[PDB]
Symmetry: C3
């Protein structure tokens, strides 16, 4: 009877029951939502500074998704029994939330914003990640911060050749696609996916499927905001078009005219030149003449640079390097570069390069993951490393940051679906990708190098995988779609996207979108051009390799697998374990019988393994 919520218990969303509550908990945050999606509960908070730090210069947004093991009725596994540094899940999901909302803050807003999402209860069916996205969105636009429309989110699956909305953990066991999507009422904003070799049509279909489905939730949020959101924080942007045109009136040609040596990316040299030029004589202090903030001109400059380029590409047709929109950079794959490593590749495309090395392991090498939804054992590990020398800079080394965890994850999603099944190949695989040069999708370079490194390693990959990173320039009067984008091209795009798959379908599509009006018709085309690119890349790729090696490396351990009758396990293990010990001692192979009668035999020889297997079969057949 104290406190005053205010709930939108409403919505049955995908036939699952979603509650949005505010005004009971954390009433001191700017906005705070306790969201429930039938039995899974998360708390999301938004707080924002009511003023700017002296010379900010960039928008300082922070998102913390965090899981508490009590949400699953467990105590942490660590030696400390307390949750600590974020897990892979926590890192990824934070990014998942960050990505769509970041570019939805009103132009020029650069006050501290922080979103904490804490998962409080996990029902073992509805993943708290999507719920987490929704609750964050809700909290934000309840806070009164200048944050444009609410967003919604959804996960799309593909079972029985049909789209399924927010598939439960169990339903996902059945699905040929894990697609997460976030966007507003107007624009779809973020896509992250893992796909079982499905068609562009299928995938893009699921993108629109989500975009419709999630509207229910966006409406629900807008409803709760109208009963309960705060007074908007007064901050309207600044018509910069005024001063911006009066900058074009000077450094228009002065920039255009010459980036653009190029090399030694300086480029930077002429660039800073132009910057400083407009800076003084543009407008500032004492006084005499003017006027117009000295710091705020910096941002107006980068916007103009950005602009200038785009138009250059829109109107014939050629990009900063001398190349076409459709042109992929020269490519060279090269396998077995580190002959004693289980598998190795060098993949180079233009000025992006990755050394990738496969390593084969046994059961003792697979990774324990203390998931909220119950602990699992991960046998495919991919680690992505982005050292500063790759871009010709110096910088702090040591322990992956978010970006590296993300890119790793992307490449991981790309490759996983092509891995052979346990039965066929009972090894754990760890790929490490070392980005040694970078100028536009090192992550794609990662997937391609991995495809090769695995083949070198002798992994019966069902089909090899390629990746390309794309951009899209969109003006009111027309649009360009860019293939294999440069570093300098990353920010010009209204939308950046990365596609990887096989010669028969997509396996991962990721999309980041900055502005509304990227119409399903444009997206169709974007993908089709990428189809052509990854196809070409694959072409160039498998002239290095083209199919998996017959065998694992001479340094790789040998694991082979065999099935025996369940009622026979007692005779092979023997009276505790008299027989099997003798087999393991004598043949010198590890023999794991577990329990369905699936025996996996390992050793350094092929012979030791066959010696063992022969022994067992004489007892069984």
């Amino acid at each position: 009877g104290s406190m005053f919520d205010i709930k939108r218990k409403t919505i049955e969303w995908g036939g699952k029951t979603l509650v949005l509550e505010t005004g009971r908990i954390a009433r001191q945050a700017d906005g705070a939502v306790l969201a429930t999606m039938g039995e899974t509960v998360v708390l999301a908070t938004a707080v924002f500074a009511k003023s700017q730090k002296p010379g900010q210069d960039f928008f300082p947004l922070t998102v913390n998704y965090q899981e508490k093991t009590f949400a699953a009725g467990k105590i942490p596994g660590g030696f400390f029994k307390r949750e600590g540094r974020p897990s892979e899940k926590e890192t990824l999901v934070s990014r998942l939330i960050d990505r769509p909302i970041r570019p939805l803050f009103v132009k020029g807003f650069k006050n501290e914003v922080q979103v904490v999402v804490t998962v409080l209860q996990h029902d073992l069916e509805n993943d708290p990640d999507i719920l987490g996205m929704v609750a964050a969105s809700a909290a934000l636009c309840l806070s009164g911060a200048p944050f444009m429309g609410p967003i919604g989110a959804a996960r799309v699956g593909w079972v029985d050749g049909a789209y399924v909305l927010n598939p439960t953990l169990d339903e996902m066991k059945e699905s040929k696609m894990d697609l997460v999507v976030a966007g507003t009422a107007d624009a779809v904003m973020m896509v992250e996916s893992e796909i079982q070799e499905l068609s562009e049509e299928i995938v893009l279909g699921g993108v629109n499927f989500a975009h419709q489905q999630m509207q229910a939730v966006i409406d629900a949020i807008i409803d709760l905001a109208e009963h309960a959101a705060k007074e908007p924080f007064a901050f309207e942007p600044e018509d910069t078009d005024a001063i911006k045109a009066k900058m074009k009136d000077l450094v228009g040609a002065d920039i255009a005219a010459a980036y653009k040596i190029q090399k030694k990316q300086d480029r930077y040299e002429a660039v800073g030149a132009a910057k400083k030029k407009a800076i003084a004589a543009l407008g500032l202090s004492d006084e005499n003449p003017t006027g117009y903030d000295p710091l705020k001109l910096g941002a107006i400059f980068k916007e103009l640079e950005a602009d200038v380029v785009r138009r250059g590409i829109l109107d014939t047709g050629l990009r900063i390097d001398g190349r076409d929109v459709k042109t992929v950079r020269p490519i060279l794959g090269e396998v077995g570069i580190l002959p004693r490593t289980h598998g190795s590749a060098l993949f180079t495309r233009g000025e992006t390069q990755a050394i990738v090395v496969a390593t084969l392991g046994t059961g003792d090498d697979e990774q324990f993951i203390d998931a909220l939804e119950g602990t699992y054992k991960e046998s495919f590990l991919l680690h992505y490393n982005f050292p500063p020398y790759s871009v010709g800079e110096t910088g702090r080394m040591g322990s992956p940051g978010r970006r590296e965890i993300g890119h790793g994850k992307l490449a991981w999603r790309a490759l996983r679906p092509m891995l052979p099944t346990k039965e066929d190949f009972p090894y754990t695989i760890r790929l490490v990708s070392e980005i040694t040069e970078s100028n536009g999708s090192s992550s794609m370079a990662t997937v391609c190098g991995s495809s090769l490194a695995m083949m070198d390693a002798g992994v019966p990959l069902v089909r090899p995988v390629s990746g390309i990173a794309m951009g899209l320039i969109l003006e009111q009067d027309g649009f360009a779609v860019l293939s294999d984008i440069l570093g300098d091209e990353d920010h010009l795009g209204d939308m950046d996207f990365k596609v990887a798959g096989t010669s028969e379908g997509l396996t991962s599509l990721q999309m980041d979108i900055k502005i509304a009006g990227i119409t399903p018709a444009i997206m169709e085309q974007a993908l089709a051009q990428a189809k052509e690119g990854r196809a070409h890349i694959l072409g160039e790729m498998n002239k290095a390799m083209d199919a998996p090696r017959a065998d694992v490396g001479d340094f790789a351990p040998k694991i082979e697998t065999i099935n025996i009758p369940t009622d026979k396990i007692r005779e092979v293990i023997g009276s505790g374990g008299k027989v099997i010990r003798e087999i393991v001692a004598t043949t010198g192979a590890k023999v794991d019988i577990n329990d369905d009668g699936v025996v996996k035999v390992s050793a350094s020889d092929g012979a030791k393994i066959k010696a063992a297997i022969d022994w067992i079969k004489s007892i069984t057949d």
Copy 2:
């Protein structure tokens, strides 16, 4: 190296020999003492900067208590076999030392000071912590730093109805009270305790007991200082009384009436008016020399503000939030808020709020603590989290800092004495308390939330526990004692204290005191008012619950126990685990046989446990 110590191998203190030595070791620190309390030996160092960092702002004191595992003839258990990040003990004891000395530095002093205490040898009887406090004190007032009088410290126990001074680890096994106290010769400064349901009389009796007992040691220190301390470091403020007087006239009346008022949130016009007004009339500008630095004048304002607020309270009797000295804020406890969690509560008191979740576990969930004195297994874990959203702010999230470890520990002390025995309740208990709003003791809110959440979880707590945080205004002509203080109020109080306990006695008393003059007779009253308060709050509390649930939640493992013949264990485990795991997989119950024949079966259904038990017995006959 020929040496000149200077030793005070002195005092039977509490019947143990205490040695204070200087001049032999660490001669380059400003002060360095090798303290020994009959066989336990620590080295304490004090060093301080001889000048201030440019715009300091706050007094930068650091205390590092650290244990070296060789002190107990052990090698660290880590993978690294080197001692590393501080333990719980290490963090707590540093705070314990920090707390009393921090406010004893001369007003205005803001140079770096660091105290290192290193435990060198542990005799498995006399705890290094107390000795550590002593040693620190000694080193400081030997250093020449502007540190006022020495402090002493003591632990008081309570065995067989009598006060025990510095009880040894064995003595403490019999004691119904762990009370640690620190102070100067004039005042008690710091109290931290864990208490088995003892009366305010007995507790406070123990505080005076310590206060007198420690004088022997303060004496000892004073003595060593005169044989061996350094030249005092020349420093002195800065009298603010003067410039305060020129401002007490200017805005006095202003802020004064500018208070009652009321509502506008913290009175506004005359408030900020007075602020910038007094700023203007003074503070350089300069325009006129003299004076200010509107950092130094800003500080003098805070002091002035406080002074009138306090005066406001002494003369009727009404507080910032317009409540009586004795009035506790509205309170609402709420159980089972996350119904799948083993036990949950939301406790809300005014603008302080904690979500508390109990989680029940077994033996693999209890925490290893390798104390110097012997490694033990902790089965009651309390983790306190203080996210910045609680107070409307943004901040770095991740890895609990000292204050959170402290507060957790406080709440832990408060609850532990009411825990059921292993026999009655064979579970590991982990409470985590998430502070979602904060305006005055979140730690006390944590105790109350915990007491409820445990009851929700079905833990046969012997009695429920409540906590209140109090304050004290002290002027020459009178005093006010405040109940359930606001945040704002912790600043102006001359003494802050936190009391928690049951309907029948105290379970934790913590005190922090900034000034002398805090009479035994005043403390008696202070506690008695708190007695009334925590009683009130308990009243409010248990209208939400009042007694433990008879049973543990449907999601908590139920644990049942049965015996089997030792000569049969092999039949139950079966060939390679084949049987046992079949039973665990099918019945869904975990089965723990170990070894004398004790089988303990657990699961969330009683149906699974009984199914398992039936299965087991058919094999056992």
Copy 3:
């Protein structure tokens, strides 16, 4: 993208094949070399900032040596299964590379430079560390940074009375000396070693041996640089001799007296009377423009500082603290200061002081080290701690930094060779050395205190070990060799070196050298003076102790050991530990079963151990 390497697949070097490749990998670094020494492969990069950060102050060089577990076909064993924090090897090898190159950058250069060395493949024979250093050197002087290399490196072994170049890990098993050495064509720059009690003669011999054998690699690099290096980055030094004479005329008196001071530390004198004094005289302003930069005089000031101080020693063999070049500071060792700790010592020499504590443990206490080349179990642990109060400062506490890891390692190398064999003494040893005061080699103080602390602990050390830190002034005419250098004396030396050994030979020699000109005749003498010093110090040391205790501390533990058939290990562990834990529960002894069937049983009583042993034997016999 098409490549243009440029490889120097050349050199048979010590009968291994060394390849240096550039132009295929990491073409965006300033310099990038993939080096292979027959089947071991590393990638080294060098990058340098083309401009200086605002008011830099110091030359900001960073070296990252890192190993990737795939280089040996293995997956990291962490709970994360990813390489993380650097390992000891990783930390030390970074230092190893850092040390020789740092003082080879052209005077006054203070732009960011970073060297990353990543081990990509390890052939289980040729260590990547030497290769690492070579590759670094190569990458650097391909980058076109102002770096006065190239440098080479080598490791020298001593098997069957002859120097062995770049011994393989198997060859090292037989060697009585692990000596790694780096230098330019003109000077040896860096020496780090662990030595089995070998003569100064033989050790110095190995130093020259390396210096000659490494020329091959230097030349190889110079060759690849001429086919492939970049355009040198224009940065000309600055004739500082110009200003520097003027300042001698001002503060050259003001400095001499302040040193003649002591100990302030402080030194308020130097503070003021250098400082703004010389700056008032010379230095940009507001008031006076023309000329010198307030920053760059700082550097010139330090160099004048050194110059005065040095000169004082050549003119009057008398040093800051009033002592002779050969004079070691007063020394006092003290054992059993922490009588319950297994062994303890206080070592004080002048104003450097270490508390050192030995601790005995069993097999559960030895440290797992998963080297690329094969995971092993380390049973001798030495941890060195250098807390800021030792020098009168305040500072972050916690997790040892590179320097502490290094100094620990140094002391470790110094003592290890005199450890008893496992047979005689089957314990884990952990030494912890707490540096409680410091004014010149705390590391050496560490080895001395350790020698004592282990003796106190009862460890049958074959011979005790001492160490001394030395310096060298080398001028246009003559040279001084300084014994037991002060902190202040570390900076001025053209060469710093630390020597430790027994009364019968050297155990560890470390050298860091700033300039050429150091004839083998100078080193011979330098070492011989140090011989006298460490001899002297040992003398003063075993006034405190003299020989190991007959027995281990009363607070134990004791270990007795027994052999059992391998096919019986199963019956002593029992079904799921059923037997062994019951044995450890009841007898109260730790039970350590190896593989050969070598069981070591340990506890605080002999009675507990015998109970355990009897129990196991009852299971074992007939």
